[PDB]
Design a protein around this ligand. Sequence first.
Ligand code: BEF
Ligand code: BEF
Ligand SMILES: [Mg+2]
Ligand SMILES: [Mg+2]
Lengths: 209, 200
Amino acid sequence: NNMNVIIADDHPIVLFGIRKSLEQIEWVNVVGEFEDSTALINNLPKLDAHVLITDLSMPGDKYGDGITLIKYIKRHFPSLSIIVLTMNNNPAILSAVLDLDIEGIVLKQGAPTDLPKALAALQKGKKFTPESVSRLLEKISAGGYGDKRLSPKESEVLRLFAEGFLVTEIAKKLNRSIKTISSQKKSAMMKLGVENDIALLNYLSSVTL
Amino acid sequence: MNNMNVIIADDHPIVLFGIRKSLEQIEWVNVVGEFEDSTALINNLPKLDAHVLITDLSMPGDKYGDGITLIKYIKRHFPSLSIIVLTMNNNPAILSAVLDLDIEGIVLKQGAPTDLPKALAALQKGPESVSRLLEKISARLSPKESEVLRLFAEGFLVTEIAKKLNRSIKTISSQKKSAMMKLGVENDIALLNYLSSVTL
Ligand code: BEF
Ligand code: BEF
Ligand SMILES: [Mg+2]
Ligand SMILES: [Mg+2]
């Protein structure tokens, strides 16, 4: 069973690496390489791909990147198997990708064999989870907020935080007190499992909802 | 041409794989070692007759650091070594600080796949990559402040930022508060939003 593979990453050095690590796998065929999400979504309908190995952070205004792009691929190419290869190791981001029920997550900070092992497992209709992914996924699992989703109010505050506004600007913009905005903000944070402001913005750069 | 022994360092093994692939074409290149943190790199440099280092900017290593600290350490202890920095960092202040250290090349991970071969060829001729990027920046902060800001913005807590510089919690906190006021932000959140809009 040959597997036709599409690779997507905004760093061409990584694309070369992915091919370099896949050259030893005889049953893998690379039918396309893309560096932004517009080019990827445009070429998906014309290649007959079985698997996508995709990055999370990439350019592309039309279809975006991150969780948004992956959801989009799931809806419109449901038979396509997805493995995410990402440097974005924020537990909240990775738990969000795991929620999408794709065929694997691999970290660029992980082991050199993690990607070929993910593909090997997929050939056997199985899921490979590296330890490096498992560890920080258990942090969010254990804490116990994985089930909960954002309210419209919470989403509203965070969407403006995602365009770089401060708590005092959002209060004025939504016509709410600082106390209310902060309470809404911290409640949203507890749900997403992000413990500080840098973690929150990094989460917000990978989801646009 | 003259044969070059090359050492590669990056905390992402996929990138290390990619660099080998980019250089496998070049007859005169020989890769003599691959390292994923600055401690393994520095420990091994004297044992391998390295001529060129292709190094990442952000990598683990508390002992010799990363970034500017590492490059300075390498310049001082290995003056016969040529250094090419290969990085995803696209902050003008950081890059200008790296380019102040007189390295022999810079390649951005966003740039073309041929840039690395091309930077190697320029090392024989005695760099275009530094110039082009300097002009890209042309068309405020200190190197010590820049590095504190990098570490913070990359995801590292203030605690973690102490050990990579052997500066205390107070000294990194003070340079941060200085750099924040020096840039025009008064807030951690405003600090990341600034970094976005200054990006190359
Ligand atoms: F930019 Be990818 F998510 F490593
Ligand atoms: F982590 Be490197 F600076 F791309
Ligand atoms: Mg990327
Ligand atoms: Mg790195």
